[PDB]
Amino acid sequence: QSNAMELLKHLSQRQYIDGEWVESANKNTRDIINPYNQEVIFTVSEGTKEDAERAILAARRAFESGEWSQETAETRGKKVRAIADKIKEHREALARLETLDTGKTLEESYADMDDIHNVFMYFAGLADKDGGEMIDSPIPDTESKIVKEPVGVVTQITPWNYPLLQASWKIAPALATGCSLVMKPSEITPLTTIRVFELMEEVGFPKGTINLILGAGSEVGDVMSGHKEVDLVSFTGGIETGKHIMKNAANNVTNIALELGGKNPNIIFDDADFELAVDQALNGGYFHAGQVCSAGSRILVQNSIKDKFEQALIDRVKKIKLGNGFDADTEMGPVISTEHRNKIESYMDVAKAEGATIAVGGKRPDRDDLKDGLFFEPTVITNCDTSMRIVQEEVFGPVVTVEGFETEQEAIQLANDSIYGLAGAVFSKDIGKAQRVANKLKLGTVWINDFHPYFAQAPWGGYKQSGIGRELGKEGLEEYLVSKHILTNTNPQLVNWFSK
Amino acid sequence: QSNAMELLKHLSQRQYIDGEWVESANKNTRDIINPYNQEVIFTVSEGTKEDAERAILAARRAFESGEWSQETAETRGKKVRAIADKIKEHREALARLETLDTGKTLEESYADMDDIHNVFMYFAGLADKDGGEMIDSPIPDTESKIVKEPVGVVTQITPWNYPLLQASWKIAPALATGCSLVMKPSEITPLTTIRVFELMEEVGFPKGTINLILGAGSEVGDVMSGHKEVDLVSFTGGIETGKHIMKNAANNVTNIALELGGKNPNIIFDDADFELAVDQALNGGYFHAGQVCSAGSRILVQNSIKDKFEQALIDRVKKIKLGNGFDADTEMGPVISTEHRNKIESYMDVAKAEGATIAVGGKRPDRDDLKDGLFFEPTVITNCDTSMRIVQEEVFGPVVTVEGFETEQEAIQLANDSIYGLAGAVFSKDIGKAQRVANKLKLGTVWINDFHPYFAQAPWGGYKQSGIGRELGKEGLEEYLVSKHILTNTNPQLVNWFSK
Amino acid sequence: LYFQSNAMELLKHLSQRQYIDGEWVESANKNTRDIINPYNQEVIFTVSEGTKEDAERAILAARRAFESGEWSQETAETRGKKVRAIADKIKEHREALARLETLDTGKTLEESYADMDDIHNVFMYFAGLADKDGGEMIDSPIPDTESKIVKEPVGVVTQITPWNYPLLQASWKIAPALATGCSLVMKPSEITPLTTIRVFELMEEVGFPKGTINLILGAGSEVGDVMSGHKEVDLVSFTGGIETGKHIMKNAANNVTNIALELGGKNPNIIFDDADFELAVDQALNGGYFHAGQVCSAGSRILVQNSIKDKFEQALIDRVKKIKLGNGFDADTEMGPVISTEHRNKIESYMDVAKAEGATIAVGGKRPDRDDLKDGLFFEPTVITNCDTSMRIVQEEVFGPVVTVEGFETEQEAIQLANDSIYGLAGAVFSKDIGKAQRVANKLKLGTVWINDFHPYFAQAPWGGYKQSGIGRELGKEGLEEYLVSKHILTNTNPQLVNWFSK
Amino acid sequence: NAMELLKHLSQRQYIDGEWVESANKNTRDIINPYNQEVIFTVSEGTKEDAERAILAARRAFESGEWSQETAETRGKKVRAIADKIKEHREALARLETLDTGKTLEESYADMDDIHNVFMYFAGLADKDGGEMIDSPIPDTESKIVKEPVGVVTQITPWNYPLLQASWKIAPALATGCSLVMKPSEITPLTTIRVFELMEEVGFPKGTINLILGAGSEVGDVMSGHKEVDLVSFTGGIETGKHIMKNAANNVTNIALELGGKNPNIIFDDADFELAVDQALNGGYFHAGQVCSAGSRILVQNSIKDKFEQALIDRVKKIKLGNGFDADTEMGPVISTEHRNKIESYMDVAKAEGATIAVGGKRPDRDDLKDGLFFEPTVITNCDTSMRIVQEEVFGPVVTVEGFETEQEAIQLANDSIYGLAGAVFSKDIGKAQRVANKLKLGTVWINDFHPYFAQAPWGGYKQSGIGRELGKEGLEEYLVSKHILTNTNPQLVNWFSK
């Protein structure tokens, strides 16, 4: 862990606007915390509205200059590839900074860095593969083509749980398509985003193509979502903030891409491989202490094996090892902040009040090495039903609910009974049945006999309140493009509708 | 005309909800006017917000039943084709009804009916051509596929200028993809939309798949944009209402598709075919009395031919024949309502007060055959510049402004100097220069040596404040689809992250 | 009830001629050919037997039409409306066309109805595809250039079809050719021209420019080499057997002409112990015996898991004994006759091949003796057992109402055996374990694999073979693509002298 | 020093993971066409070697080590090959110049292209695994999965050896195929070198194989073996036709690129000195030995005389010499046999009445005496009926025909058996576009001559070939479609009695 602290000795503490590392316009700063020990680890600039607007205007100026937007797609791909290579080269430092900033295990952080390399690499390869189309015009003597152009100036806002990963999903396609961008990471987790800006700067982009704003969402966020020079706002986070952003984006009829979490079902039939299902239910509920957009917080298990499954899950939950993300034996780290731990704690009272049982966990751990950190015990909530708040709302902590179902129709009905629609799983050795269910779930991603996979090759996003648009895949790239129909009349003749 | 009045004797006067023609829940009605003579030609139900809610719930019930959403794409295509055939079969009566309701010339209405038949035909043919893709998974022993499903329940709101045409652009892809829909036409122009619902009923769709709500947006529009069971709201009209709709859609993180008009440039270089340019300047400015999303209201003409151009334009403008749309000699009909004529009128005062010249036109005709209708003279405004409201704001009437430009670079700068980005034209015999300009205009559609063309094969929509999303083409169909990534782990193994 | 006689009355109004450059014409030498009904071997019609000079004239008319641009430069949207119009003509004459196909080929009327419904949908699919993809805009790596790929009709196409599903195979070739803007010259099998003549009559009513569509009638040995080897042909599309297909490809090579070939198969039907047993017996029958096994996709090679082989063989044999043979026009008929004297001789010869190599004819293997079948080209549905992969009866395409049954021990063995042929067209896997079926499907070298089904093909998806089963695809977007050619147009928008060479 | 590079270069075939000699111990001498010096000696492979390599490629394919590797990972390896080409660009350029005679600057350009070809296909590898289909049958799921085509044989020619190899190798590897490649027997150096570089990157045993030797000995095995799924060949029409006839024996897919008679259409309103500049480039780069060489100039009648004299005056100034010397503009032709063919065509042209306006012979100068040089040539007063106009000479020779109308230019340009590429020069871009639309060519340039790149497909109409190389279409030659149809609620049909 002190080796990670050493990394901070060379890390920038500033915003990056129009090709320069700059302080806040009023010199304000913010102290960054390590959730493992609640110690202040770094101090960064806290930007102003003026800074955010300046970055947006620099992005517009750069976009209009054409240096990046009119560069060949092949060359843009090379630059995006160079970024992927930097990430891999600095994987260790990046993974350690991510663990320090966010608390999750170092092995999870390394996995994030592998994913990030692959995201940049995927978009590097896609950059030059589709420039638009030739249309067969229904009008004689005309030519019709659709040209795909970069959407323009894009603002990008990320959350605190997977900072660099979420940033990469936005940055890679933006750069690949020729856009100029302004990014703002979560004010409590800026370290790896600062670092990636330092790396991108070495790759070499024209002034203003990339810009980094650091600051509170209530201060600079509205500028980023409501400015008339922005062509697209892309946000990953919670529903309350996402709705706010969308309403603000409306003022200029600005494109929005949103991913807003979920209430992700994990559907376990009685003909599932039982021990696989237990394993994956643990993984679904407790990776990163449940702070994952796709966390499997809502377990739905067939009635015939429900009690056995609950007991098996509880027995394993008792063995989950909490601690420092830098310690190799740690299986689950702390939650992100005092506010977030307070949210999770409040839900325990809620669950009990509405009739559910806390079968295991449901409080902070007592153990000595955990008392100064933001820890919360992995928790199983039983005797639940779909009417309850603890089932319907995104807790975003190390908490899972267990509900029973009798039939395949009942599972589908329950799984779809939420305001969300991000991801979910179906476990059954009967692949035919699993497919039937998968076809009926209103979710952007359905895993059959798995839990958690996402990758650059495939689009990710939500039905219903889980979002608008997609990230990753060809659809992810398309968020950063705009279509133009250029129609040429090759034998123009007067219409003579109006009197001569 | 009186035979079109005879047509009304058989037209429905009601809403269509859940397979039934039905009155308003409050029994309220609205009188429909003919703008040519301001006479009441028809009376229809004025629905309530509970009617809109009921239609939405019926559309959701139908969608979940699967009767349409799970029908084969091939069969959905055949039913869309059957609607197309009905449009052609009833072309004469439909064109007459459109002229009666909107005031446009019969020729214009026939052209509209021919386009509508082709829109339905296009989407009928697209219905079974793309169900998603197979993905090359980066995870060994996994199968990854992206399945494209209908987006779900969609609400569709249309304007009064091209009622049935705009309806076709939304209805055709919605039905082709398997969505259930709730449509609400402009309260002052419901006639052809009622008629097409009659024709769709004849083709036959499951109960709840198609629903027609009649009434003012100030009453039922908030339900249509803000209800939780809606998956996509698609709107065509003005910016004010579009913004309000988007803010309301945000409450449920609902997809939006918007087309909100434009300030469309018509750029004429000194090396244009002169007489072609004059002809098309007239066509761009005055078809449907300038009430076109893509009307060419902002003429930019190269300085060396400016005086020549304005005199030729103005001399042609004086010869424009106003009158009854049913009269074959009419070149321009009336504007749509007293409210809209009043807005156009008020802009003449703005133009004069800010320093522009009304070169010709600028008033209501008062002659016998026009005095009783909502006519407004075709108008040319000169000696204006980009700082003026008359240049920046969409008047949406039979009015054009004329600005000069010195160079190709200045033409592009002026053309892009508006909040809009829908469509525009470049006129020049130097095709190379026309293409350079077309690549730099921030517009969804650019015509080279033409003005007005749109067709089902190519997407249509705006950059900037002209909208979000596209209609027509494969991209328009994609508004009505949602992607689902189904990932199957074909050799699942325990991860064993958490201790045994 | 009077259906056969009413079908025969149709022939009184059917053209007997070729259709070349907008006109119905006799053969240049006035030769003719008698067409028979395989049910009774009677002559039912006489048609012109064209010459190589007629074939050449039609190719030159297709080339002239192509170059005129009336169809090739017509808008895609309008081409699509015309292809739809053909689709609607097919539906308008469904009954007559189906009856004609039964009269000419012998298969049951119910089978012919299904063909006509399929044909309607093939034309409708391609009508709808016609205006959906004109090419692509390319991201040029050269500054100050514009790059696009335009898709154009491939040009003049010759199309040669076989005798088993004459109108269906014709539709697979004609539909995309017309949708894309090609000119075509079609030659149906000499022994089965009736529905193809009728469809030409219907296409003429729809209306196409002179020379866009041409029909040649004649023996492949007389006019075929002209159709595969003429310098003015851009693509030769053929469906039939391997020997003719290879000959055609070698002749097409003389002008480096594109070929699309579908040459039959040795299609495996893989039945696991955990299959739905009665479903597998039902589909083994369907696989083996629809159209008397004269189907490119026939399931002639049954591979059954050893643990249920005896039970399966017994169940299949008992059902085979019940199959009702007879006239295709009779409602109770389940299987009609085979197509010709020659083809029946081939099938019979393979019975002797099988026995000589040690296989058993478990049921069937002969002409039936029942009085109402004696005058027709009937052959009993047949099951051959005690087979193995080394045998010619297992390796070679018999194309008759004959199936072989081999056992396999494991999933690995089933795959190994199924892939141990020179062919690669289609096959099926029957198992309730869908994961297992999917693993097997991924390992089979076949253009189409069905999981718990047998026979489905449709316009929406490409059909064709791996290995000796073919080259290229028919149906789907890939089928359309056979009839298109890509052109890269690259415009230098800032041209400058290279100044490489001295001045 | 290119000669010193040879001290470390392999002299053997690469079969099933090993560098091996042939059972034929008579090696082949490789020549530098600039001085006709023997510069290297290599194994001459046998039929038996070719068969062994095809069997190894089949074994490797069935093993799944490459064919079932993830597309993402295959892309990474193809990228690694791209990086090797860039790392070694200088050495590879010198080897290509040494082996083929072309100028060092042209060789550098090939190497930059080659890097980009591999990089393009590396990026494409994981971008399309097939389609989901909307089945017309209720309760069925339909998907089209794209698999590697299988075992592919690849045969390349002597003019652009490594470039032509890259066009085939890159998509084969990206898609998961196993390959057996055989370069032209007279130009194997850069192909040997790239196999050494691929071995460094590392591929499963048998995935890549290099056969060296005469097509007349091993070619029939490569085109006619039953275990081959696709034969991809670039060269001349008569070998191509032979290959296609042999591939028919197993109904094997073919992709052919067979050259052309490429027109260069110059209108009166073209930029005149641009058109002269580009006519020289079209005709004489690599001494005309280019699949897409602009050997057939069609010039509008108002400027024809002026154009001909301008072109002839420039042709007289073209600098012949050693490709390694910076002043050289045009190197030698490839071989004795090829120079002989060019010479024979001059006799054909004269006997049929055409005029040899300039050139048409070997040069007289002393430093050119030892090499395979041939003078850049312009033939005038000819017409479309002549063999010299219709047939691919593939040497530093152009013909000039006049025309009046754009319709005539189109008709003459299309009046050949070929259809590979061509150009239209005119400042009237609308006119150039109308012409481009009617030309039966795989690539048409407006106001340029020669460009090709990985992003766009390349190939011929008519006798110029079958299929495409480069672009997404090029990748598609190396894939095969499989429709997997699952019936999700299977019911008995009950057609047959029970």
Ligand SMILES: NC(=O)c1ccc[n+]([C@@H]2O[C@H](COP(=O)([O-])OP(=O)(O)OC[C@H]3O[C@@H](n4cnc5c(N)ncnc54)[C@H](O)[C@@H]3O)[C@@H](O)[C@H]2O)c1
């Ligand atoms: N398209 C091009 O870029 C290109 C390149 C070289 C030659 N050509 C044309 O072809 C003419 C003849 O040239 P060439 O004879 O030197 O080349 P060719 O057409 O025979 O092509 C050479 C390649 O084909 C191989 N080959 C020869 N016989 C073979 C066989 N039976 N089976 C398989 N492969 C075989 C050679 O070993 C070599 O790899 C030239 O004059 C020129 O017109 C075109």
Ligand code: NA
């Ligand atoms: Na932190």
Ligand code: NA
């Ligand atoms: Na017959």
Ligand code: NA
């Ligand atoms: Na050499």
